[PDB]
Amino acid sequence: LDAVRKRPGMYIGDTDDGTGLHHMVFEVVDNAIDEALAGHCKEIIVTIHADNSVSVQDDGRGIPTGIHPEEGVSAAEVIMTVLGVGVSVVNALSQKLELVIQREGKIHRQIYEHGVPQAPLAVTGETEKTGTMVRFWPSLETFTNVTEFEYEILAKRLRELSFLNSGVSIRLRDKRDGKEDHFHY
Ligand SMILES: CCCCOC(=O)c1ccc(O)cc1
Known about the structure:
Elements: H1 2-6, H2 8-12, H3 19-37, E1 43-48, E2 54-58, H4 75-81, H5 87-92, E3 94-103, E4 106-113, E5 116-117, E6 122-126, E7 131-138, H6 151-164, E8 169-174, E9 180-183
Parallel strand pairs: 1-8
Antiparallel strand pairs: 1-2, 2-7, 3-4, 3-7, 4-5, 4-6, 8-9
Bound molecules: butyl 4-hydroxybenzoate.
Subcellular location: Cytoplasm
Keywords: Antibiotic resistance, ATP-binding, Cytoplasm, DNA-binding, Isomerase, Magnesium, Metal-binding, Nucleotide-binding, Potassium, Sodium, Topoisomerase
Main location: cytoplasm
């Protein structure tokens, strides 16, 4: 991820005017929509948290957790740490990122800081559900001037995506003021 850290604007977009900041959400959402499409219920939930982080959840199968035979770490960690720009870019540019995967009866969790895994992906409990959740806190070392998520910028794009990905339910929630929307074509 050092090439991303060196020139963040070249991967994510302008880091001063809010472009890049919002693109971080859109990259995660692209992956969440792919995941939701391969499941039965087909819903994603995008939440703006009061602490300026965003989470994106899907109810798909869960991203793969098994050890990548070449890289020797979980497949999930490979996706997060190896170079759509890819979620690894989001991870590199987040001061914190939390990954939760529900798959094959188990909850799996991992935390990253500035793209660095804090421990290996780990099984933390049991579950009947399936899906993936990524929550990220954008790095305020990278993102300047515009540092807070604008609801309407996210809403506009999710609306466009709902028409293109018809049959996928998209929920948007703002925990700062309780604003919410439901896009479903
Ligand atoms: C089968 C591998 C799919 C790759 O998925 C992702 O990179 C991913 C990232 C963030 C999400 O919220 C969901 C999936």
